[PDB]
Design a protein around this ligand. Structure first.
Ligand SMILES: [Ba+2]
Ligand SMILES: [Ba+2]
Lengths: 103, 106, 103, 103, 103, 106
């Protein structure tokens, strides 16, 4: 219904797709680079999650240009997503406070 | 898996002298090293935990020091009751492991 | 009273429970895995906090599938919580600015 | 004037004080702990900043209970501060959009 | 048009400039310091991105006072930028919810 | 705990020659190494701080270099007043520790 709540969902589905494509593209970009560790899918997927949340533990990170490019899209999607929910939770709290007042 | 090396295996000291037992970890383990004492036909008994924390009920004579990969268990002025086998044990990485042990001889 | 302020509290209590269950579940999931370091409760609890805040220092992180699963719930709770306070502080600032104006 | 803008300032001054007290308390809590690296003020201050922003590089982190306790206050102040500005920037954007419309 | 949407853009352009100046200034400040690793532009630029997003992997960080100073500006720009979009997405969701209601 | 190795223990050099003292840390310590000079019956005196930062009031003759685990203290054209014992000290990890020292001999 409400756009904000829709954008939230849109962004969660999207984030999930970026996480999945990100894991796949990461491996593709990193394999071929000596010393690269982001080279198998399961751990790449975990890597994408820790990147989107910005937790960063430093157990895995891209070392090639494309990998880092992929990393930037994942970070931006994660940050933009997680920040869009917050904006959604605000339009909700604000719309509900209006009632409890006089609108 | 973490290997704990305890050398020497036997330690000879004169009554009342100061003695130090060594324990080297094959890799950096912070201060996640613990010490146990086992007398003939006895069960192990916690002496020191986390490299230097005194345990309650253990003679002040006992102390521990170290960090990373080098750990030392010391006894001030040894005495007959201290004659036993000493072991170190790490809890930094699974699975927990034990050192080979050192025998105190007076 | 006000929903937003309630959700904030709800999320803080909740976050605390997830932190606690997270520490416990983490140890349970990681013990049994060679090289795992998230294997004692006190440090696991510190790990959960650095995860929920996304600070990440990299001194501790899960290496098993369940551990990482537990990690994802902690990150999401932390992020969702910390972002819900912000949405709460906004409904407050917005509701108070309305007065200082003419509503 | 406007509360939100005031809270922002209040939080920035406060954050600066927590950063300073944090650097001092950190050193105090960590010295005495074998292997501790957060033991001189200048780097402790840099540590506090990377903690409050949650950047975390992992070049420095507390290893004692009090240090970690201090760390938690710094993280929470940083996160709460940085999230309070955002709530401030929202009450501003919202209050200004109202005009450009019809309130 | 709408200020919020403008500030968002302003902040994105700005962030990009800070990222670029940051990469350049970082190298300038770190070269000359033994053990420094943030000493070539390409990786410095990647470093600036991981800093602004606060992802932090710990593969690169400044070790000099100016470098860290540069780091603080990048973190603050990244955080302030990413938090300004969120405040922008909130003024949008809030302005649109008003219609779907009765304003 | 960080071990600072200073070898050789004695260093013999001809008047005016260039000399270098060595200090190896059992682990990477960045540039958190400092140098002190102690003459016979004297107190230690800070020479270099943080591996290479000159201290105010110390002959330009003195310089320091290194990072990680290898550090060097150098003196351009030694001279009688330099005859003394030199120590290195680290502040990277608690507790601070000192090297065994090197004696300069002309
Ligand atoms: Ba972060
Ligand atoms: Ba990190």
């Amino acid at each position: 219904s409400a756009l904000h709540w829709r954008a939230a969902g849109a962004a969660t589905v999207l984030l999930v797709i970026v996480l999945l494509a990100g894991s796949y593209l990461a491996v593709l970009a990193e394999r071929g680079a000596p010393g690269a560790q982001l080279i198998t899918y399961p751990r790449a997927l975990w890597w994408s999650v820790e990147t989107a949340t910005t937790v960063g533990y430093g157990d895995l990170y891209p070392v090639t240009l494309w990998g880092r490019c992929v990393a930037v899209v994942v970070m931006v999607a994660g940050i933009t997503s997680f920040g869009l929910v917050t904006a959604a939770l605000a339009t909700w709290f604000v719309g509900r406070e209006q009632e409890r007042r006089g609108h | 898996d973490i290997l704990l090396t305890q050398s020497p295996a036997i330690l000879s000291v004169s009554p009342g002298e100061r003695v130090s037992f060594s324990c080297r970890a094959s890799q950096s383990i912070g201060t996640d090293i613990h010490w146990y004492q086992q007398r003939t036909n006895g069960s192990p008994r916690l002496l020191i935990k986390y490299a230097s924390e005194s345990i309650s009920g253990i003679p002040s004579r006992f102390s521990g020091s170290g960090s990373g990969t080098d750990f030392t268990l010391s006894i001030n002025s040894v005495e007959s009751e201290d004659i036993a086998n000493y072991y170190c044990q790490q809890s930094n990485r699974w699975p927990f492991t034990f050192g080979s042990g050192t025998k105190l001889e007076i």
